Amino acid sequence: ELKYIATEASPAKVAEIAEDSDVYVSEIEEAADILAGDPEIDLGIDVTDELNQLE
Amino acid sequence: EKANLITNAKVHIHKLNLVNRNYTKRAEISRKNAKIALRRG
């Protein structure tokens, strides 16, 4: 049985499946930040001073 | 379709104008980055 555990807790496979998860994690989180990319448009198209009179 | 020929020209005028909006925005965006980078030194 130690052989059968060591077949499938193989450190050759533990390290594979751990590395794969990390790449997908940074792929998804950065794909959330470009999903919030529009602040760069909002801060750009509106620069309106005039309301300092309104202030 | 000579009418559509004169139509098509009048169509392209709107595309040409559309892009002219787009690059106008980027022009100011670049100028904002310049103003920042001067303040960056």
> Side chain identity at A1, as an amino acid letter?
E
Count how many pairs of residues, chain A against chain B, have C-beta atoms within 8 Å: 5
Residue (of A48, A40, A34) closest to B26 by Cα position: A40
Q: How far is it, in rounded angstroms, from Cα B38 to Cα B41?
A: 5
Looking up tokens 């997908």, which residue turns up?
A24
Name the experimental technique: cryo-EM
Question: Resolution, in Å, please?
Answer: 3.5
**Phi then psi dihedrals of residue B6, to 5 deg:** -70, -30
Cβ pair B28, A44 in contact under 8 A: yes
Residue (of B16, B13, B27) closest to A44 by Cα position: B27
* Half-sphere exposure of residue A45: CA atoms within 13 angstroms, side-chain side: 8
**Phi then psi dihedrals of residue A38, to 5 deg:** -60, -20
> Side chain identity at A41, as an amino acid letter?
I
Residue of B24, B29, B31 to mutate, interface with A, max A Cβ within 10 Å: B29
